[PDB]
Amino acid sequence: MCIGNSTPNEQETFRAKVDEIWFRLTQKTDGTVMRDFLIEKAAEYFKQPEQPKQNAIEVISAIMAPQEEQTKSKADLYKFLAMFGPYETIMLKIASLLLISNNKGHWLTFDPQAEKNANNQRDSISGWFDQNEPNCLILKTPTGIRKIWNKPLIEATGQYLMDENGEKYDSWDKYFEMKPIETYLTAYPTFA
Known part of the structure; x- marks a missing residue:
């Protein structure tokens, strides 16, 4: 598990920040923690x-996908910060992806094994974040994979x-405007 499309400095610096915020939220340096406890701390902080x-x-x-997963480790926080940039605007980046996903068919999913269910799909849209490369969003559109x-x-x-x-793009909005998910005609003759 490692962020992709990043240089060595970016991976090294990102790692540091994950260790930091994790310590700041759990008051630990590793180990696991109760799910409800991590969400609570992350909520008031982010x-x-x-x-x-x-x-x-x-x-x-x-976003913490497994709703029935009792414990959460630093890997889970690593994953979460990887999907939504720095922690200062984490809520803005989420608002942007979701903004489109909720008004385009609800194609976004966080539940693990979201990929094993993607292959069992042909003419449907599905978007999930790669498990081993958290900062990468794989989009399964009828026209291929982006x-x-x-x-x-x-x-x-x-x-x-x-x-x-x-x-490069300004945000999830801007990008899903330049590269729309679907393409279907809506033009219609009018003999007014």
Whole structure:
């Protein structure tokens, strides 16, 4: 498990930050912790000024895929920060991906083994984050498979996206506008 499309410095620096925030949230340097405890701490720490803690809890909880997984380790936090850039705008990057996913068919999934269920699909849309490369979102569209990388170190204000071709994007909104998920005609004759 390691962030992809990043240089050695980026991987090294990202690793440090994960160790830091983990220590700051669990008051440990490794080991595991109770699920409800990690979500609680992450919520009050990653929420926005005007965001209800309950809302931060629901959002984080959903993203922490296994709803029935009692313990959570530093790997789980590593995974979470890898998908949504730095912790300063974590809630902004999530708002952006979800913003599109909830208004385009609810194609995003966090539940592990989300890939083993993707092969059992032909004419459907499915998007999940790679398990061994957390910052990479694999999109399964009717026209093939796309790859888009989140820059864990770049805040929401910057261009935190980067596809396989190397093109950078302002956010999940901007990208799913330039590269729409589906393409179907809606034009219609009008003999008014």
